[PDB]
Amino acid sequence: MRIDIVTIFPACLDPLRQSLPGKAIESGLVDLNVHDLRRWTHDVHHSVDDAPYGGGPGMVMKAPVWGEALDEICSSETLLIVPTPAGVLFTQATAQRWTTESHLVFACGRYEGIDQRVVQDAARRMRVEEVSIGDYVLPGGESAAVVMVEAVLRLLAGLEGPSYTRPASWRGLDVPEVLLSGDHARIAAWRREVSLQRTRERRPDL
Amino acid sequence: MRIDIVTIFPACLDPLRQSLPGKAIESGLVDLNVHDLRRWTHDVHHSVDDAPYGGGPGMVMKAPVWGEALDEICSSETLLIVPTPAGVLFTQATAQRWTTESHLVFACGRYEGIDQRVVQDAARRMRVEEVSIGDYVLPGGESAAVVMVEAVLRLLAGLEGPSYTRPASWRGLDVPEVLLSGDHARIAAWRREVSLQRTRERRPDL
Numbered sequence: 001m002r003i004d005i006v007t008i009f010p011a012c013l014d015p016l017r018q019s020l021p022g023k024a025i026e027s028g029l030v031d032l033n034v035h036d037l038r039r040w041t042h043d044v045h046h047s048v049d050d051a052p053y054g055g056g057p058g059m060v061m062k063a064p065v066w067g068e069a070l071d072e073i074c075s076s077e078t079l080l081i082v083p084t085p086a087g088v089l090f091t092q093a094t095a096q097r098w099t100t101e102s103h104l105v106f107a108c109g110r111y112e113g114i115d116q117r118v119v120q121d122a123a124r125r126m127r128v129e130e131v132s133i134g135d136y137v138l139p140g141g142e143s144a145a146v147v148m149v150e151a152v153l154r155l156l157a158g159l160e161g162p163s164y165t166r167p168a169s170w171r172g173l174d175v176p177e178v179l180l181s182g183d184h185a186r187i188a189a190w191r192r193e194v195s196l197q198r199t200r201e202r203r204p205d206l
Numbered sequence: 207m208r209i210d211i212v213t214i215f216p217a218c219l220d221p222l223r224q225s226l227p228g229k230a231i232e233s234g235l236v237d238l239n240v241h242d243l244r245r246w247t248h249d250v251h252h253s254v255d256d257a258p259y260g261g262g263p264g265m266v267m268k269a270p271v272w273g274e275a276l277d278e279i280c281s282s283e284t285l286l287i288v289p290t291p292a293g294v295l296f297t298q299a300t301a302q303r304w305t306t307e308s309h310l311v312f313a314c315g316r317y318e319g320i321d322q323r324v325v326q327d328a329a330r331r332m333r334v335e336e337v338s339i340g341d342y343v344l345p346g347g348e349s350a351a352v353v354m355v356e357a358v359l360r361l362l363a364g365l366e367g368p369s370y371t372r373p374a375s376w377r378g379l380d381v382p383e384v385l386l387s388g389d390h391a392r393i394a395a396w397r398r399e400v401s402l403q404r405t406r407e408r409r410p411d412l
């Protein structure tokens with residue numbers, strides 16, 4: 001797989017060079033590229049942002065600088081991923097289907113976001129997905145991109161109940177006797193019950 | 207605020223030293239500490255994991271090594287955050303209330319997770335929260351911790367419709383005329399409509 005990440009903060013994607021994402025690149029399975037958006041600016045200040053039309057707080061990421069960036073990087077086979085709090089939610093279903101792609105481009109937005117037309121224009125030649133990682137507000141799209149990339153890369157290099165290891169008794173807390181029984185069907189029966197219960201208390205919607 | 211992050215991958219928390227999270231530490235508003243869990247191991251191999259009781263795939267993070275780590279770092283006033291796919295969902299409501307804390311500890315889990323007793327024992331002296339960032343599977347809790355910390359740190363240093371900046375016309379795509387009208391009540395009326403519509407198409411549950 002080929003992954004290109006476009007951002008004003010390349011260093012924010014350095015965890016992708018560590019642990020399993022790093023093992024995926026070193027195995028030669030994934031080719032990761034992280035680009036500074038400012039490499040496509042031609043002004044003396046390397047401005048990527050500007051004042052929003054219709055006013056409002058914050059700044060808006062310039063469409064022509066992004067347009068130039070994505071014009072060189074993308075092709076008609078590219079899946080352009082635009083992380084945004086306005087997108088559809090990222091799930092494991094999304095991670096699983098992204099493993100069937102040869103080229104993923106992550107257009108990481110800063111300030112108030114990216115000029116909407118970048119997405120409309122890109123959709124003329126390639127598929128585009130606007131995706132949120134959850135119901136919370138982040139200052140940028142780089143942390144979201146790390147999350148999405150390691151979840152895809154986890155499958156590439158191929159509610160949960162509680163886990164216990166040695167010792168059997170620790171600080172007055174004993175490992176449930178059932179996990180020391182040797183009855184594999186009984187162990188499975190318990191794990192289902194505890195998971196089902198944990199699911200009702202924390203995520204009844206699931 | 208004081209933030210301590212315990213992990214087997216300290217480098218995975220380096221984006222917190224960049225952008226706004228970095229501005230929060232440099233402003234002296236937040237004191238960030240990232241610890242290697244292996245600094246609390248006494249064996250020759252610095253083993254943090256071991257085989258699970260009742261069997262099953264993968265390894266389980268040892269409770270005594272974590273117990274020793276959290277014993278030194280935490281106090282009775284500490285809010286211990288255990289990122290896990292078994293936790294309650296992280297939202298903006300959670301980020302907003304975490305801004306009222308003086309000490310947050312992030313116990314980042316690897317392998318199949320942390321021995322459940324670490325959480326049960328810690329809950330004897332301090333408050334504990336098991337939290338998931340979404341309906342997807344990650345190889346570790348460090349990316350989740352970056353997400354949660356920048357969302358809290360964003361508020362500390364204090365669906366959305368589309369955004370547009372200069373030029374008015376780009377690649378045959380014009381900025382909606384309404385944003386060039388000068389009628390602030392009309393601009394607000396439109397922004398509500400487009401957001402409400404985007405919300406119905408992507409997040410009707412919201």
Ligand SMILES: NC1CCN(Cc2ccc(CNC(=O)c3csc4nc[nH]c(=O)c34)cc2)CC1
Binds near residue numbers: 083133141142
């Ligand atoms: N007081 C208001 C709060 C919301 N602001 C909008 C806004 C704009 C840009 C962002 C940046 N978001 C991301 O890059 C992002 C990218 S993926 C993602 N998933 C969940 N939440 C997220 O914030 C993100 C967040 C919020 C406007 C001012």
Ligand SMILES: NC1CCN(Cc2ccc(CNC(=O)c3csc4nc[nH]c(=O)c34)cc2)CC1
Binds near residue numbers: 160343345346
């Ligand atoms: N084939 C099975 C797939 C699930 N595995 C369980 C498992 C254990 C540990 C993790 C690690 N998760 C996190 O550290 C985590 C921490 S916060 C979070 N939020 C959403 N999703 C997440 O995975 C996380 C993920 C899945 C068992 C094998």
